[PDB]
Every structure is written in C-alpha cells, then in structure tokens.
Design a protein around this ligand. Sequence first.
Ligand code: FES
Length: 56
Amino acid sequence: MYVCLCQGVTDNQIRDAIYEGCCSYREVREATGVGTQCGKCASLAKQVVRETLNDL
Ligand code: FES
C-alpha cells in the first residue's frame, strides 16, 4: 500500500530501506522522502519503521 502518496512510498519500500541498513526513522526519511511534503503520513510511516526495526 501507499503510506505516502506525496512521495510514492509504499510500506514495502519502507521495510526494504530497513532491511538494506537504515537504522532510524530519520534515515528512512532521508532514503525515501516519506513524510517530507504534506507530513500527514508521518505517524503511519514511523509505526512501520519501529515495528520493522524490532523484527530485525
Ligand atoms: S502523504 Fe506523505 S508527505 Fe504527504
């Protein structure tokens, strides 16, 4: 699904960024742009990031 329409970021792309080495929400945002435009998706993006980091 699209977490972030403004930047075309899907949930699987967020997970990809983490499995590829991103270790924080800030890094996922820098890698993908998630949440940087209107900001409205940030809470959902943060949830995906934290759950995926805990599952490494
Ligand atoms: S939906 Fe993600 S920044 Fe607008």
